[PDB]
């Protein structure tokens, strides 16, 4: 009887990885350092932070060694996205267990030789306190969602991509979800995307459990916006989903902000769905958008937790957001 713990359960720590100059954060390292420090301190008020700091990142070591509720792990990374390389936690017949899935640079698009080895190092360095299982499947933690009660929400955009687990069919992928993570049902959808995203539409940017009865998703009202069709096709798939007691989900649409562009006019994938559920607090990305406050008030209605915005305009320059930079640990 195994089950993937939900993000809304009691979290012991949040695993992260500090930006350093041995990566694309190099071309704006000072801003990157700032936001992560601001994010880190926001989160440490609600859960202990365990942060990977590249073995050669002296500056970041300093910036972080005297921060209350922060523990540092000297572990090298390609990048900051601990959500997708971080261990996936299951409770297996009572016992906490960490699953080390293969991380492969989002279907081999980016270098991930260091990211993939992160869990291994943390465990060998004694930072991870539970058994660590090496998994023979490629799986990112941002690609799947658990309600902790046997339902896994995920999509085909990501999971059936040719560079994840090509030797498996959809049936075979669902079967490993059932057998490794303890899913009783797998909720699958097929539409929805964000322009600028390279993860192959990670569910954690599109559609997530807020709680065991509620799915929060990315939305677009602008019929002129390129996303309108695919996001409304996605919404109608969400509407077909039933809980294990056969009752519909409550569904909470969060409208994506106004278009954000890089300096070469390529659109950035901003979304409010890339929140972190963090013990007493729901921490929510904001984008210096007029609709930021509305998002936050909207969510306050559906949770007894404290809603905190945190600015992620720096994070989305590198095509990810708050949730992508975290992994909860139990």
CB atoms within 10 A of CB 65: 10
Here the CATH number for the domain that contains residue 105 is 3.75.10.10
Domain count, the chain: 1
> Can you tell me the distance from the alpha carbon of 20 to that of 70, in angstroms, rounded to the nearest whole number?
17
Backbone angles phi, psi at 123, to 5 degrees: -75, -50
CB within 8 Å of 321: residues ≥ 6 apart: 205, 269, 270, 271, 274, 285, 312, 315
CA 300, CA 287: separation in Å to the nearest integer?
A: 18
Please give the structure tokens belonging to residue 293. 């406050």
Q: How was this structure determined?
A: X-ray
**What residue numbers bound the domain in which 41 lies?**
1-330
How many CB atoms are located within 10 Å of the residue 8 CB?
Answer: 21
Q: Kind and range of the H or E element at 41?
A: helix 29-44
Of 320, 326, 313, the C-alpha closest to 31 is 313
């Amino acid at each position: 009887m195994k089950r993937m713990l939900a993000e809304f359960e009691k979290i012991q720590a949040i695993l992260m990885a500090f930006p350093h100059e041995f990566s694309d954060w190099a071309y704006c390292i000072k801003e990157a350092r700032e936001s992560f420090l601001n994010i880190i301190q926001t989160i440490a008020k609600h859960a202990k932070v365990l942060v990977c700091v590249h073995t050669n990142d002296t500056i970041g070591y300093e910036m972080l060694k005297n921060l209350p509720g922060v523990e540092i792990a000297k572990v090298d990374t390609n990048d900051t996205w601990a959500r997708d390389f971080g261990a996936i936690s299951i409770e297996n017949h009572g016992v906490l267990e960490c699953l080390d899935f293969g991380f492969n640079g989002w279907g081999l698009k980016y270098p991930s030789n260091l990211d993939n080895q992160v869990n291994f190092k943390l465990k060998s360095l004694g930072f991870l306190k539970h058994p660590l299982k090496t998994m023979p499947y490629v799986l990112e933690g941002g690609s799947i969602e658990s309600d902790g009660a046997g339902s896994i929400l995920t999509n085909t955009q990501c999971l059936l991509e040719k560079n994840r687990n090509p030797h498996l069919n959809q049936n075979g992928i669902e079967t490993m979800l059932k057998k490794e993570l303890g899913a009783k049902q797998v909720l699958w959808y097929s539409y929805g995307y964000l322009k600028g995203d390279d993860t192959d539409s990670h569910t954690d940017t599109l559609a997530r459990f807020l709680d065991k009865d509620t799915i929060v998703y990315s939305a677009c009202e602008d019929k002129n916006d390129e996303h309108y069709t695919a996001l409304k096709k996605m919404q109608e798939e969400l509407k077909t989903f039933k809980k294990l007691d056969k009752t519909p989900y409550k569904l909470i649409p969060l409208e994506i902000p106004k278009a954000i562009f890089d300096e070469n006019q390529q659109r950035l994938p901003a979304t409010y769905v890339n929140f972190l559920l963090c013990n007493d607090a729901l921490i929510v990305p904001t984008y210096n958008d007029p609709k930021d406050a509305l998002i936050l008030e909207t969510l306050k209605q559906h949770t007894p937790l404290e809603v905190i915005g945190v600015d992620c305009n720096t994070l989305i320059k590198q095509h990810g957001s708050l949730h992508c930079v975290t992994m909860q640990l139990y």
